[PDB]
Amino acid sequence: GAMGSMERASLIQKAKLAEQAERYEDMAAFMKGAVEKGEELSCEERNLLSVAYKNVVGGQRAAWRVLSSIEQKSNEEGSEEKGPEVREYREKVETELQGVCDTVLGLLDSHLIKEAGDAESRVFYLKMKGDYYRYLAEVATGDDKKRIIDSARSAYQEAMDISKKEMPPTNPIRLGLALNFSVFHYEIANSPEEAISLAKTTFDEAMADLHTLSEDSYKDSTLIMQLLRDNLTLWT
């Protein structure tokens, strides 16, 4: 890999610079290089990996949705035939998005998850696995769509099981996992009632645990609780 000659610490340092410069493709490449050094990632390093790829795939997802909308309009009654270009370009962006998801999933499988023993690392990576299968499910339309959805579900479920056994209900990783799994249920799995129930129960169990927290931990947890509430307001 092109980062094979760069020191691990230099890759980390440059990932932080790339974030400051809003160079998220660079940030992701630096973090991929750091993962490929083979050592486990610290909490901060896991977060840099996630931020980098979240920004990259976020731009691709936004572009894909714009193009998909144009493509759908072109296939409406009365719409002038414009040739293959919209489909081709949507397919181009889709393939690139799938490539990024495959890259992230590949890092998780080789070998971040299998070396992650602590709940905070293991839940974090399993949540990420669910998230990137979810992004693949957003664009899937073929014979593997059901399997992609099931892969997302399975990763989220394993993360949930660990999080409930090993983390307090206010833990921000646990909360963000629940939030994202609820979005999976609503947007991917056609299960809005499961989505609502999960968000509700998560919010309520966190509320009851806030009294145990410092001021700074309280801020961290309540921020994510508000996202759960925002979704519940949209969905109900």
Binding site: K16, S50, V51, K54, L179, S182, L227, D230
Partner: peptide, 9 residues
Amino acid sequence: AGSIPGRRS
């Protein structure tokens, strides 16, 4: 609905 934004360290 929104997932975790997750775009800032």
